[PDB]
Write a protein that binds this DNA or RNA. Sequence first.
DNA 1: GCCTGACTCT
DNA 2: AGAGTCAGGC
Length: 580
Amino acid sequence: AKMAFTLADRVTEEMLADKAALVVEVVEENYHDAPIVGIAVVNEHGRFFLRPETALADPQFVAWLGDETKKKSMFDSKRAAVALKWKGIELCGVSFDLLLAAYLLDPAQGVDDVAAAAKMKQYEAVRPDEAVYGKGAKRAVPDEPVLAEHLVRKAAAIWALERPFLDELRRNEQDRLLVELEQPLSSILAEMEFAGVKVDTKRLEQMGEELAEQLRTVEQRIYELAGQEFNINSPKQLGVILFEKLQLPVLKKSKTGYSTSADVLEKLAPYHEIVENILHYRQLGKLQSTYIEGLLKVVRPDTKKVHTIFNQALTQTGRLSSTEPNLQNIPIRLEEGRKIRQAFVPSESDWLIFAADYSQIELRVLAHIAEDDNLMEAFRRDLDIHTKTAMDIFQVSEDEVTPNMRRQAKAVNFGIVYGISDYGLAQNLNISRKEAAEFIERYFESFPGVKRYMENIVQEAKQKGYVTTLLHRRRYLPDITSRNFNVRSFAERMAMNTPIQGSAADIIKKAMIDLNARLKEERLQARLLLQVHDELILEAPKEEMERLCRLVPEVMEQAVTLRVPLKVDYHYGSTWYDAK
DNA sequence: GCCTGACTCT
DNA sequence: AGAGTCAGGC
Ligand SMILES: OC[C@H]1O[C@@](CO)(O[C@H]2O[C@H](CO)[C@@H](O)[C@H](O)[C@H]2O)[C@@H](O)[C@@H]1O
Ligand SMILES: [Mg+2]
């Protein structure tokens, strides 16, 4: 059965109505500078398919695309907006994005095409993209009649589905979350991705060469100490060398044999010199394969920029993710790895990189939502939260907090945030379950409000079926009623963690929106380049630094008002590395 | 081609 | 707790 539509060869006025479902199809997973393979419009006057070489060269269609008062309903408008930016065309007036609507209604559905969103409301008159385009090697744009019918069915689905999605969003009290947060954020992310980040490829290559030399040296030491050559990057081959040839103790096994995970290796270190060398080899090898070679693979040779894609409709807690490359996991913890950041530079001469980050946003959020008196007071005094947590758990003065005590209190703070469990904490601090339970017990004695919150949120998740964040993002937790201890326990941790991690995600998203508006009002040339969960990275003329130093922290700090202050630290420099 | 297990980040 | 990428290997 084949849906009726006009296969148009020229644009007409009735295609330019002030309300329409719009499909601007980009089949390449990475949409940066990618082809647009077809366009479909469904509105009051009918259903239309347009070839892109026709539509995009029509002045009236382009004018309609960029006219803010002509409203469009779409799926994944950021994909279209970005593909259109590369062609020098502005997309405006997108008042409804079905991908973002589906994501807000239930992030666990993993909706990634119109068909999956449609299935949520018993609408099935549209094919999954994978059925049409195929998968992997055999992936391909089909012939025009098939392609056209597909885009029109997607448009028609968007047209039919807008009202029930908005209606449910409204009952969820998530209508503003879509309209005033996620959709405006989607435009901001499109600009960030399109702007891209400049890479000093010569610097990267130099680092690659030094790395290659050190890798060879560690590699040869490894063969020396094992008394033979083998594939160090083969967990199978390595396990044989470690646990059979060298007789190292077996403390952990994988599902598939011996575990050679990094924490297993740390413990083995005192037995044989080879172990530290393997850890080092693996550190350097990760830098080499992923942050030199992999990174250089995705730099555009023409502009020396990388253009990540932020997935805004993926994570279960409302964070963004980043791909091709992932710019949210660039090394920082170890100095040799952190040097990778010297290769990320401003895109114009006499510009600098500026980075601002919230300090302890998750614990500040927890203090607000739990209304824990002790925790709120700690932030009101702007104390070192880890030292203060140690003072309370160990019942000592600040003077008596040793480094090991602070380290352990820090670890409990992590656990408390992730949904605390004696097992997870024990694993982390290399201690017994009974020991870990005493820590948690001491914690809850010092922060009774936090304990009440943990109990109350788990009950609420049971009662309601979901938990929510500050700005009404929602996560359903059906395993919270499971009679399987481990399944139920995962869900209980999720109930505890999600309002924390998710409310922190909400706050920085709102900061981003506020920041973008302030930058425009101030006519600054500064631009957002990246978000890394609790931090924003910008580039700007060196002449705007002093202004950004006052502006960016204030905007981020005032994004929401909590029972405790938000605090933002900031730095700038000639490279991302230097913005520290 | 998918999987596993290893690594990277907040 | 939440993510993404890579080499080895089936
Ligand atoms: O365009 C991003 C948007 O598309 C989806 C599918 O609807 O993901 C596709 O694009 C991502 C970016 O290239 C890929 O990582 C992903 O594999 C691909 O299916 C959504 O998940 C995402 O929000
Ligand atoms: Mg921070």
